Design a protein around this ligand. Sequence first.
Ligand SMILES: [Zn+2]
Ligand SMILES: [Zn+2]
Ligand SMILES: [Zn+2]
Ligand SMILES: [Zn+2]
Lengths: 98, 90
Amino acid sequence: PETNETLKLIGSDKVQGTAVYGPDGEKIGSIERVMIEKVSGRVSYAVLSFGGFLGIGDDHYPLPWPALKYNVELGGYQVMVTVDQLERAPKYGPGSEW
Amino acid sequence: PETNETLKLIGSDKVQGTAVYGPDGEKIGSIERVMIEKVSGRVSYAVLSFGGFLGIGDDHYPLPWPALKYNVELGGYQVMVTVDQLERAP
Ligand SMILES: [Zn+2]
Ligand SMILES: [Zn+2]
Ligand SMILES: [Zn+2]
Ligand SMILES: [Zn+2]
């Protein structure tokens, strides 16, 4: 009796660890977490982890929730992100002046 | 550079496993996951796992997001549910 997915709803423990593919269908990495607004409970952005391992030596690319299209064929999210964009991932979180 | 909490945002991976306490400050269970609306990105409810073990033998209680008040002293969410409510969990 653990449903972690419904027709309209998805569990954060299911989102976490889901493969993320680029336009070309190559795996870039996976979703490490979603960052949820403490007040409203709405997802601000999803954290795409890539390079190295989740939690160690990875980089992070933040994705708006709506950018995460689940591709049945690939069994994961597929996003519009290019190599150049990934290369220029922010060194600090999005909420930072730099 | 692994941060899972800021002033305004909490990471789903930190919310998961967070202790849940009742009005009297006694631990009921913990948050097992939140369920997010696929189309809006809004958290529909968080799943409170209580009794047995996380995922195995446990019971579930759905807590709307505003129902979760973080309590620094207790170190977890404090929620207003009674034992009789928990007993009639769907
Ligand atoms: Zn799915
Ligand atoms: Zn990471
Ligand atoms: Zn906190
Ligand atoms: Zn459970």
